[PDB]
């Protein structure tokens, strides 16, 4: 519908949240400058009003655009031989978090108990 098929039972804000690159306040601003209320469900949208939603969303980076941008951002750090590139390659915390214990979102589930 709008880049992808957002849910049809929910409000417009919460459904728009399902697009990559749109959260909550960006959805509110979209529906604010799009001349559309936000308590109307997704089923009850018209064609012109949903078309204004489409027209509005073309000026924001969403889905593969952002994925390519962030992948290039990580790749540059990896390939200029920085510290953050080393951390990205080894799968260790990139910010200054401590790794003596308890860094599991990066290291995955607790590996082989030695």
């Amino acid at each position: 519908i709008a880049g992808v098929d957002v849910p049809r039972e929910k409000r417009i804000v919460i459904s728009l949240t399902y697009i990559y690159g749109i959260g909550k306040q960006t959805a509110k601003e979209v529906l604010a400058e799009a001349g559309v209320s936000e308590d109307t469900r997704t089923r009850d949208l018209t064609e012109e009003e949903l078309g204004k939603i489409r027209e509005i969303l073309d000026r924001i980076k969403v889905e593969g655009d952002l994925r390519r941008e962030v992948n290039l951002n990580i790749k540059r750090l990896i390939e200029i031989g920085s510290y953050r590139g080393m951390r990205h390659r080894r799968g260790l915390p990139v910010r200054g978090q401590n790794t003596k214990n308890n860094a599991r979102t990066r290291k995955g589930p607790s590996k082989t108990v030695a």
Partner: protein
């Protein structure tokens, strides 16, 4: 300086050790200033940065601008336990 005081470069590193390497600039610069921001005019030269023991030579590329001079000289060594 992560603010609007301007960027930070240590004066002894830049003043006439970087702006002075304009003619026949084909030699390394030894420095202990790990804390200096890599300016756009740093690019082309190779700087030797102290890591705690030794001077590691880093050749400033185009994508290193805005980073700290010490990001490219790791201090701790670790090889797979």
């Amino acid at each position: 300086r992560s603010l609007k005081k301007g960027p930070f470069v240590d004066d002894h590193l830049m003043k006439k050790v970087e702006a002075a390497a304009e003619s026949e600039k084909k030699q390394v610069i030894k420095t202990w200033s790990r804390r200096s921001t890599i300016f756009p005019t740093f690019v082309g030269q190779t700087i030797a940065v102290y890591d705690g023991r030794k001077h590691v030579p880093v050749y400033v590329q185009e994508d290193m601008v805005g980073h700290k001079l010490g990001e490219f000289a790791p201090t701790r060594t670790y090889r797979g336990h």
